[PDB]
Design a protein around this ligand. Structure first.
Ligand SMILES: CCCCCCCCCCCCCCCCCC(=O)OC[C@H](COP(=O)([O-])OCC(O)COP(=O)([O-])OC[C@@H](COC(=O)CCCCCCCCCCCCCCCCC)OC(=O)CCCCCCCCCCCCCCCCC)OC(=O)CCCCCCCCCCCCCCCCC
Ligand SMILES: CCCCCCCCCCCCCCCCC[C@@H](O)O[C@H](CO[C@H](O)CCCCCCCCCCCCCCC)COP(=O)(O)OCC[N+](C)(C)C
Ligand SMILES: CCCCCCCC/C=C\CCCCCCCC(=O)O[C@H](COC(=O)CCCCCCC/C=C/CCCCCCCC)COP(=O)(O)OCCN
Ligand SMILES: NC(=O)C1=CN([C@@H]2O[C@H](COP(=O)(O)OP(=O)(O)OC[C@H]3O[C@@H](n4cnc5c(N)ncnc54)[C@H](OP(=O)(O)O)[C@@H]3O)[C@@H](O)[C@H]2O)C=CC1
Ligand code: SF4
Ligand code: SF4
Ligand code: SF4
Ligand SMILES: [Zn+2]
Lengths: 208, 297, 115, 96, 156, 144, 63, 176
């Protein structure tokens, strides 16, 4: 591994593995999987019912005390039965470490709101609802935060079109801004960039 | 049909409707609505103008890129008319002045200009022509307005046999002079009026462009209800919450509206005329700081 | 089988109750909305539009979808009451500037290739 | 090598010119039409054919790294001349 | 005759007055407002041309749109434009305002500010330099110098 | 002291060809500084430098009064500078096109043109491609 | 705590799609064929969903 | 390491209290700020005399686009479509076909300058130095239509700016 290759830290990998095993042991009721990546990141996979217990444990426990909510977001994977996965990123100032917690849901199953655990989660859950349509139960005030008033649909879903369905302009007859079906003078050009001759053998999937 | 003029798209802002229309006098009250209706469906509009471009600025957002073209012209020259209607297949005449200027009298405005426009359009091969005159345009009219309108209608029909004559009846709208003048006063019981909505006239013109059998026909655009002048002004003042142009306009407004049941109207163009009761608030809400008028049928 | 987690209602009856509550609230709000926004529409056709929007989702046979639609309608009502919208957002429900799309076979055949 | 349309428009190097019945000509009235006066085909036709005493010649368009990628041209066919795929320059062996 | 001479001279006077003092209000939507403020910086000094810094919308002469116009924002921009006294002009600054730019194929972006308001000058760039925006302002001044209102009223 | 600054002011008045040229330059460029002449432009632009001024003000151009077809006594703009003097004037190089001129090419414009927006010489976009589909031409002879 | 309802899933009213872009379109489910210009097979592993092709016309300006 | 910004203890001796009272009653810091502003008035301003004086620029500056050509006079573009593929804003549209002499040349080359972000990716993707971003920036336009450049406009821009473009490329090409 000469200078063009990224250096690998063994000590952090072992520490994160040990802490993941520790967290898995303490909460067997919810934790489903623990992973440590080759660039020293620890993410924990839990059941949806354990969002509040796991987050409260990670925030309040003396050994964890992850007091800072770095980010909360969602990822849309249409091929899964549970369409959306919910990702929590946490930072610990006491021990100078970062942890990730992943959850899953679909269109109709609500997720428990974590505003009681982290005050920062309010606007993040509002944005998740606005962009993906994931409902959060017991939220103080859940409503759109980014889309226009009266906007229909959720744009960050994979089946939503890039340019949407309606566009805006000014009409002199009605003397106001109106919404009409979208027509583009030049259609967005779609490029097929993926090549054959796979790049990374280490990620090859079984031929099923 | 010249393939580049074949309709395409879904009838939207960036579609192609196959209409290249020249709208003379498009900077007026009806011109803006005509240009807007033509541009919202993807047709190209050539806007001839004599006014400062600043006064034509409001027509810029009515069409997509390249779909609206502004050219300078004057009525006393035929070369400008030729170069404006050279490539158009539809020509609409909306030129008209309600008063008399020192350089353009009613004769020039309503006889010589429409005749020259029709002659040049016929010589250039323009397929369709739409001309606008008044409903009360009769040769023996006391007012010079309607006399000149009748003479111009006759000469246009002579010059362009396939032209369509449209006779609206004292159009009212947001930028009209009917309701605005009646609300700016702050005689009657013998004069009956027949107001017509601006959007109805615009849709009628668009349909006449689209309608194939309306080539040499003459249309009368009239509203749903006939009103006596006194109670009409009463209703106008009541809407505005208010307590109750030199020589020609007063004798034209005291004059009654004609009735020509033989001429086709808006209903033959598939338009349900909107009653004045719906748009009275729209027009007169700005004059402020229920009991509709009685009609005769 | 197919056990699923409730959002608000356990069956269809509570869903109908919430739908009726939301319809009542909208029916109250229509006249005040019409007056406050200085709309050119009448209260009658505004309430007719509310009725049409409620009828648009009349075929739903699942409580979760029903009360999620109720949640979205409550969000819209909250936006309308607090005057967070402008006249354009309210007037967008009527599509007064869109050409009327014909339905018969001949018209669609003449206009283009779109079925 | 700009030509003129029978109607009166200039013909571009790509050969574009609106036909007589075309309404889109109205965009050029009271204005002009943007046409480049230098045609690349005519300019490259005026270049002399280089004479080299080798079967294979290399061309980079001149200027080293300011030209095009370096390519090699075979000059065994005496019927025609070797033409660069990028620059258009022509090379030829000393026939006779 | 003297009739055209007097109106021509008065028109020149009015045009000089209108173009020598342009009071803009700026819609600082996005990072083009940074170059807008850099044109007000000591190096370029828009004030030295008679162009005041951040005039109120009620007594503003020209609107400068500097940033992306979203669908949620367009009604407010139109409302502000409507509340301007009649001798008003609009300058479109930057690619986002000119044609939607780098967000042209977006579901929440207005594909050009000219869908909402008429535009007099288009300033290209991403962003245009403060000097490029100054060039655009001077071009607007020349355009104002070119107009003729009293002549048109005389020949009508 | 003050006498010195007044003397430099009178030298500025003298260096512009007297009071007439002084008023000319003051009302055309809003500046009365005098600098060494760098070169003369083909369209009439004059270029000056003064290395004692701070960066940015050490180079300037006095625009010509009559370019291609209009009178530019008052209406001057930055698009009137030819590309070589454009490179020198924006401090992209330390060498004026007089000491070393640009490379000569047959296709380079011999007459620089300013921005022609809002002029009958403006650029009008159009498609440069040919028609894709050819229509069938019915015969001129009848069938029966 | 569990409805245990039995009915096919339908989220049509919640997606915001216009009425005429739901029952008029025709999606295609397929494994994309291998590009014959190349012998690689990495692009023929997954399943693709695409809609029916609609009208494309030439812009009057810029073509 | 870390510092404290506002962790001082005011002195409570009589002299310090009297000094603070004099500061309160006589407005010493206000006068000091006034003096700062007054001094700053008597120094030369930083304003340049645009358009007679221009702001400094660099050979790396990205301005208006142009299409270049070889010294023989033929255009450098070979319709490889790398610039159109790399364009982050999809502002380039290209069509091509064999020429009358069999050369690989474009028949359409449009750049929408109201979509362009002026990133310069196109000129660094070009293998033959055909498309560049020239030094011009004073090309404001009165209509949206004139900012939609076609091949003729770009070739005209290249012929117009070739001298400066070539000088700038000669200056900067050893960093590429
Ligand atoms: C005071 C009365 C007027 C004289 C004056 O203001 O001198 C200030 C002069 C300012 O010097 P500075 O601005 O530090 O030096 C810059 C050079 O003088 C820069 O000198 P320069 O080479 O740019 O000089 C150009 C010249 C020509 O400038 C002009 O003609 C335009 C200004 C005309 C103003 C009227 O300016 C003058 O010499 C005339 C000065 C204004 C006279 C009124 O020195 C003083 O007189 C100090 C007086 C005490 C101030 C309290
Ligand atoms: C006492 C009675 C008052 C009654 C009301 C009158 C108000 C007071 C009158 C005084 C008005 C001042 C007018 C002076 C304007 C001339 C300015 C001159 O310097 O501009 C030049 C000339 O511009 C125009 O050509 C001048 C037009 C002005 C009109 C000419 C005379 C009008 C007098 C008529 C008065 C009659 C009034 C009757 C009604 C009350 C060009 O400058 P410009 O191009 O900008 O800037 C370019 C910037 N550069 C130079 C750095 C590149
Ligand atoms: C034995 C004979 C004795 C006779 C009696 C004489 C004794 C006089 C001794 C004291 C007199 C001084 C009083 C002068 C005014 C004092 C007012 C004052 O101190 O109020 C200040 C406030 O005063 C101000 O700050 C006003 C400034 C506003 C900004 C304007 C800028 C002004 C500075 C420029 C200089 C002004 C020049 C004035 C002279 C004008 C000449 C005509 C207190 O505010 P705080 O600091 O917040 O504390 C109170 C809350 N705990
Ligand atoms: N009550 C009504 O409003 C109805 C009007 N009539 C007729 O319908 C037509 C349009 O009416 P309307 O729009 O309301 O009237 P307007 O006053 O609003 O405008 C008339 C148009 O004609 C143009 N025009 C007027 N005079 C001249 C001229 N000498 N040379 C060139 N152009 C000129 C105007 O342009 P510019 O301002 O630049 O001079 C203007 O755009 C007119 O022919 C009118 O007579 C039809 C029935 C009633
Ligand atoms: S136009 Fe360009 S510089 Fe201005 S905000 Fe948009 S992306 Fe940024
Ligand atoms: S500069 Fe960037 S955005 Fe502009 S054309 Fe080149 S690659 Fe596209
Ligand atoms: S400009 Fe350059 S990168 Fe773009 S198509 Fe031509 S040769 Fe290829
Ligand atoms: Zn070569």
């Amino acid at each position: 591994t000469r200078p063009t290759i990224r250096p690998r830290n063994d000590v952090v990998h072992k520490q994160l593995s040990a802490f993941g095993q520790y967290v898995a042991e303490i909460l067997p009721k919810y934790v489903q999987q623990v992973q440590v990546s080759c660039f020293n990141e620890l993410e924990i996979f839990i059941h949806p019912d354990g969002v509040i217990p796991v987050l409260t444990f990670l925030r309040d426990h003396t050994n964890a005390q992850f007091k800072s909510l770095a980010d909360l977001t969602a990822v849309d994977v249409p091929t899964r039965q549970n369409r959306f996965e919910i990702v929590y990123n946490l930072l610990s100032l006491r021990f100078n470490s970062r942890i990730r917690v992943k959850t899953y849901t679909d269109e109709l199953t609500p997720i428990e709101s974590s505003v009681t655990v982290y005050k920062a989660a309010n606007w993040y859950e509002r944005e998740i609802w606005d962009m993906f349509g994931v409902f959060f139960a017991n939220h103080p005030d859940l409503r759109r935060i980014l889309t226009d008033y009266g906007f229909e649909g959720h744009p960050f879903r994979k089946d939503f079109p890039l340019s949407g369905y309606v566009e805006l302009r000014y009409d002199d007859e009605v003397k106001r801004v109106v919404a009409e079906p979208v027509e583009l003078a030049q259609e967005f050009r779609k490029f097929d960039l993926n090549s054959p001759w796979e790049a990374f053998p280490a990620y090859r999937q079984p031929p099923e | 049909l010249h393939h580049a003029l074949i309709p395409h798209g879904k009838g939207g802002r960036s579609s192609v409707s196959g209409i290249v229309a020249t709208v003379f006098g498009a900077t007026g009250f009806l011109g803006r609505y005509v240009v807007n209706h033509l541009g919202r469906m993807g047709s190209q509009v050539i806007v001839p103008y004599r006014c400062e471009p600043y006064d034509t600025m409001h027509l810029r957002p009515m069409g997509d890129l390249g779909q609206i073209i502004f050219m300078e012209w004057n009525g006393k020259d035929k070369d400008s008319i030729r170069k404006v209607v050279e490539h158009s297949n539809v020509v609409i005449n909306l030129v008209g002045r309600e008063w008399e200027t020192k350089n353009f009298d009613f004769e020039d405005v309503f006889v010589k200009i429409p005749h020259a426009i029709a002659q040049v359009s016929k010589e250039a091969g323009v397929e369709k022509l739409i001309h606008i005159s008044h409903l009360n345009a009769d040769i023996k009219s006391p007012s010079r307005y309607l006399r000149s309108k009748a003479v111009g209608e006759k000469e246009v029909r002579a010059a362009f046999p396939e032209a369509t004559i449209i006779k609206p009846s004292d159009i009212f709208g947001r930028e009209d002079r009917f309701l605005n003048y009646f609300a700016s006063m702050r005689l009657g019981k013998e004069t009956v009026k027949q107001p017509v909505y601006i959007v109805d006239v615009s849709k009628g013109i668009i349909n006449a462009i689209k309608d194939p059998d309306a080539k040499g026909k003459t249309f009368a655009f009239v509203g749903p209800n006939r009103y006596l002048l006194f109670d009409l002004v009463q209703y106008i003042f009541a809407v505005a919450y208010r307590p109750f142009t030199t020589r020609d306009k007063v004798e034209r407004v005291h004059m009654s509206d004609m009735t020509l049941p033989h001429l086709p109207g808006l209903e033959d163009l598939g338009i349900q005329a909107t009653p004045l009761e719906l748009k009275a608030i729209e027009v007169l809400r700005r004059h402020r700081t229920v009991k509709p008028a009685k009609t005769v049928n | 089988g197919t056990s699923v987690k409730p959002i608000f209602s356990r069956d269809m009856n509570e869903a109908k109750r919430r739908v009726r509550e939301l319809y009542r609230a909208w029916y109250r709000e229509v006249p005040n909305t019409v007056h406050l926004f200085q709309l050119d529409i009448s209260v009658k056709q505004g309430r007719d539009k509310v009725r049409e929007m409620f009828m648009k989702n009349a075929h739903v046979t699942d409580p979760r979808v029903v009360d999620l639609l109720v949640i979205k309608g409550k969000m819209e009502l909250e936006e309308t009451i607090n005057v967070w919208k402008q006249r354009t957002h309210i007037m967008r429900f009527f599509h007064e500037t869109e050409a009327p799309r014909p339905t018969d076979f001949l018209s669609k055949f003449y206009v283009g290739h779109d079925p | 090598g700009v030509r003129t349309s029978p109607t009166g428009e200039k013909v571009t190097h790509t050969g574009q010119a609106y036909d007589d019945g075309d309404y889109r000509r109205v965009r050029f009235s009271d204005r002009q039409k943007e046409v480049n006066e230098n045609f690349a085909i005519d300019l490259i036709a005026e270049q002399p054919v280089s004479e080299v005493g080798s079967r294979v010649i290399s061309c980079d368009g001149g200027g080293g790294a300011l030209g095009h990628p370096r390519v090699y041209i075979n000059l065994d066919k005496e019927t025609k001349t070797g033409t660069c795929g990028y620059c258009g320059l022509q090379f030829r062996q000393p026939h006779h | 005759s003297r009739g055209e001479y007097v109106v021509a001279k008065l028109d020149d006077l009015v045009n000089w007055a209108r173009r020598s003092s342009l009071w803009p209000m700026t819609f600082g939507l996005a990072c083009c407002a940074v170059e807008m403020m850099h044109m007000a910086a000591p190096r370029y000094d828009m004030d030295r041309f008679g162009v005041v810094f951040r005039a109120s919308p009620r007594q503003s002469d020209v609107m400068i749109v500097a940033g992306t116009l979203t669908n949620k924002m367009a009604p407010a921009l139109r409302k502000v434009y409507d509340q301007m006294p009649e001798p008003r002009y609009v300058v479109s600054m930057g690619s986002c305002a000119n044609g939607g730019g780098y967000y042209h194929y977006s579901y929440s972006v207005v594909r050009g500010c000219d869908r909402i308001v008429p535009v007099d000058i288009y300033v290209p760039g991403c962003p245009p330099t403060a000097e490029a925006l100054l060039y655009g302002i001077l071009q607007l001044q020349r355009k104002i110098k070119r107009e003729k209102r009293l002549r048109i009223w005389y020949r009508r | 002291e003050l006498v010195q600054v007044l003397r430099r002011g009178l030298q500025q008045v003298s260096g512009h060809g007297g009071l007439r040229g002084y008023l000319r330059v003051l009302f055309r460029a809003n500046d009365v500084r005098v600098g060494t002449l760098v070169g003369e432009d083909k369209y009439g632009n004059k270029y000056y430098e003064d290395n004692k001024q701070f960066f940015g003000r050490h180079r300037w151009v006095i625009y010509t009064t009559e370019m291609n077809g209009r009178d530019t006594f008052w209406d001057v703009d930055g698009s009137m500078v030819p590309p070589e003097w454009h490179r020198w004037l924006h401090c992209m190089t330390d060498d004026p096109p007089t000491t070393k001129p640009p490379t000569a090419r047959k296709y380079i414009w011999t007459n620089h043109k300013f921005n022609v927006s809002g002029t009958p010489q403006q650029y009008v976009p159009y498609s440069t491609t040919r028609k894709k589909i050819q229509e069938w031409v019915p015969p001129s002879t009848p069938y029966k | 705590q569990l409805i245990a309802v039995d009915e096919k899933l339908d989220i049509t009213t919640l997606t915001g799609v216009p009425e005429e872009h739901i029952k008029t379109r025709k999606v295609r489910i397929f494994v994309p064929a291998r590009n014959n210009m190349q012998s690689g097979v990495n692009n023929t592993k997954k399943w693709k969903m695409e809609f029916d092709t609609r009208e494309r016309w030439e812009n009057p300006l810029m073509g | 390491t870390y510092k404290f910004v506002n962790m001082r203890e005011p002195s409570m001796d009589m002299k310090s209290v009297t000094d603070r009272a004099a500061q309160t009653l006589l407005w010493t810091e206000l006068v000091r700020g006034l003096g700062m502003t007054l001094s700053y008035l008597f120094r030369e301003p930083a304003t340049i005399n645009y358009p007679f004086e221009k702001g400094p620029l660099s050979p790396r500056f990205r301005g208006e686009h142009a299409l270049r050509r070889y010294p023989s006079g033929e255009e450098r573009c070979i319709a490889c479509k790398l610039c159109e593929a790399v364009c982050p804003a999809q502002a380039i549209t290209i069509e091509a076909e064999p020429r009358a002499d069999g050369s690989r040349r474009t028949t359409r080359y449009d750049i929408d300058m109201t979509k362009c972000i002026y990133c310069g990716f196109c000129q660094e993707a070009c293998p033959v130095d055909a498309i560049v971003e020239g030094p011009n920036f004073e090309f404001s336009t009165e209509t949206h239509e004139e900012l939609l450049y076609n091949k003729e406009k770009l070739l005209n821009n290249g012929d117009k700016w070739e001298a400066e473009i070539a000088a700038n490329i000669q200056a900067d090409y050893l960093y590429r």
